[PDB]
Amino acid sequence: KQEAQETRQHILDVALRLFSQQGVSSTSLGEIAKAAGVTRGAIYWHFKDKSDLFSEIWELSESNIGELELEYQAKFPGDPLSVLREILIHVLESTVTEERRRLLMEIIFHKCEFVGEMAVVQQAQRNLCLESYDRIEQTLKHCIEAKMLPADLMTRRAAIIMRGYISGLMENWLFAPQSFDLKKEARDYVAILLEMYLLCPTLRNPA
Amino acid sequence: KQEAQETRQHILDVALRLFSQQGVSSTSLGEIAKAAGVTRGAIYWHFKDKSDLFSEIWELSESNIGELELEYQAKFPGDPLSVLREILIHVLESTVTEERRRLLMEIIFHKCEFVGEMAVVQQAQRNLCLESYDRIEQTLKHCIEAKMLPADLMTRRAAIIMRGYISGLMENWLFAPQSFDLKKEARDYVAILLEMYLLCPTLRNPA
Orientation of helix A29-36 relative to helix A3-21, angle to 10°: 120
Cα B175 to Cα A127: distance, rounded to the nearest angstrom? 11
Best of B134, B161, B163 to mutate (most A CBs within 10 Å, chain A): B161
- Per the CB < 8 A criterion, the answer to whether A159 and A137 are in contact is yes
Orientation of helix A118-145 relative to helix B155-175, angle to 10°: 120
CA distances from B26 to A190, B18, B113 (A): 40, 10, 10
Residues 6+ apart with CB under 8 A from B33: B39, B40, B42, B43
Q: For residue A189, give how far its alpha carbon lies from the nearest alpha carbon of chain B (Å).
A: 8
* Technique that determined the structure: X-ray
Q: What is the DSSP string of A93-162?
A: HHHHH-HHHHHHHHHHHTS---SSTHHHHHHHHHHHHHHHHHHHHHHHHHHHHTTSS-TTB-HHHHHHHH
Resolution in Å equals 2.5
Q: Please check whether residue A179 touches B, CB under 8 A.
A: yes
Residues 6+ apart with CB under 8 A from A176: B126, B129, B130
Q: What angle do CA A201, A202, A204 make, to 5 degrees?
A: 75
Domain hosting residue A98, numbered range: 1-207
Q: For residue B137, give how far its alpha carbon lies from the nearest alpha carbon of chain A (Å).
A: 14
Q: Please give the torsion angle defined by the CA atoms of residues B1, B6, B10 and B12, in that order, rounded to the nearest 10 degrees.
A: 80
- Per the CB < 8 A criterion, the answer to whether B53 and A54 are in contact is no
Q: Which of residues 56 through 85 in chain B touch A, CB cutoff 8 A? A: none
End-to-end C-alpha distance for chain B, whole angstroms: 62
Amino acid, single-letter form, for residue A187: R
Closest Cα in chain A to B110:
A114
Q: What is the DSSP string of A11-68?
A: HHHHHHHHHHHSTTTT--HHHHHHHHT--HHHHHHH--SHHHHHHHHHHHTS--HHHH
Cα A11 to Cα B39: distance, rounded to the nearest angstrom? 45
Domain count for chain B, please give it: 1
CA distances from A113 to A45, A187, B181 (A): 24, 33, 25
- Per the CB < 8 A criterion, the answer to whether A153 and A200 are in contact is no
- Per the CB < 8 A criterion, the answer to whether A169 and B160 are in contact is yes
Q: Which residues of B touch A202 (CB under 8 A)?
A: 188, 191-192, 195
Q: What CATH number should be reported for the domain holding residue B120? A: 1.10.357.10
**CB contacts < 8 A (A, B):** 140
